[model samples]
Target: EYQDGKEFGIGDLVWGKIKGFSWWPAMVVSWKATSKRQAMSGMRWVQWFGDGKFSEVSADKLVALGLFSQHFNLATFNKLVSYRKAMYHALEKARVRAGKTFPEDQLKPMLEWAHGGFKPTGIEGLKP
Candidate 1:
């Protein structure tokens, strides 16, 4: 059961840096076969929420999205899910249930908090 690297599942969200853009919010829509140009043996079809575009990027080129940090593998993330709900949703998908991420208005605050170190305002039972 030796997995090679961060195994991205469908709907899994992550961050990426392209064209000097700061870690843009993105999600895994689907998977692709190994590519000749990519260093990684696998590929992911990622959707960028910001620019309204998608690309087949190598898995290794992206980083995980989570409560405390943007670096995680699926294995590590799953284990922490029990008590990590806030950390997950506070920065997950569109609307964050419809309020946390409005793509521009809401997203701005998230970046401020994300930079503030994933702190969940303490109300969401998240620690600094």
Candidate 2:
């Protein structure tokens, strides 16, 4: 969901360039300020969980994850579940390959926090 004048907070879940029956989810990485101008410039870079990659997406190309108030057929819910599952698997791969211990608390969930999920970007109210 592109909220006009909204700059997605770090770790906020988003759907950028959706594809196929399955939905691809992404996270807001604050360090990559290139997307910060989304409200004005109409583009932002989001990290996709589907392939564990980041890509530049136009404002129209991106939207927020499912809205809890609205219910779709099971396909949408299942899609979200699958996305989360993939993230866990990705984390597992990191643990196996790098031998690094990621904290369970640090792991962000899907639309779990409606009010600015995860950490807020230190730079606030950027929308012009």
Candidate 3:
């Protein structure tokens, strides 16, 4: 018999579909316990992509959206330029979650770091 209310095991391939954002056909990469404050509400899992990118999400969101499936159809990822607006939104969301005010002096560099994925180019005239 199938057990209920049990956490997902490692090597389990769980699926998730994110709306209004790129990438569907997600998979469960990992799981861990988190406090209530975690952005991922349900069981924490990483959504893997063909291009070697991943997004952290919650298990509740996955099941509620019917993202979990027995089989998965992977999609091909083409060379796509990153969008500045999406990067800015992600940074701003992080700032708000950290309980820090925006548009502050310290926030500028922090936001830049978030936008740049903490990768320092050290090149002149390079925004990120």
Highest TM-score scorer: 1
Better of 2 and 3 by TM-score: 2
Model 1's alpha-carbon lDDT is 0.48
**lDDT tens digits, residue span 4-121, model 3:** 3534433333345566544343334543322223334345454443333455565554531122122222221123323223223333433443444434345356545544433342
User: Per-residue lDDT of 8-121 in model 1, one digit per residue for the tens?
Assistant: 655666665566444455676643332322223466667665444677666666665543344423443345433134333436442352234333344446545554554543
lDDT of 3: 0.37
Model 2 pairs whose backbones collide? 1-63, 1-64
| Candidate 2 C-alpha lDDT tens digits along 1-128 | 34446456555555565545443556655434543444335455677765666666665665554232232124654447665555454334333332333332333432232123222321121111
| Residue 39 alpha-carbon offset, candidate 2, angstroms | 12
Would you list the rank order by TM-score, best first? 1, 2, 3
Weakest ten-residue segment in model 3 by summed lDDT: 64-73
Task: Provide the TM-score for each candidate, comma-separated.
Answer: 0.48, 0.41, 0.32
lDDT of each: 0.48, 0.45, 0.37
Clashing pairs in 3: none
Sorted on lDDT, best first, the list reads 1, 2, 3
Instruction: Judge candidate 2 against the unseen true structure and give its global Cα lDDT, from 0 to 1.
Output: 0.45
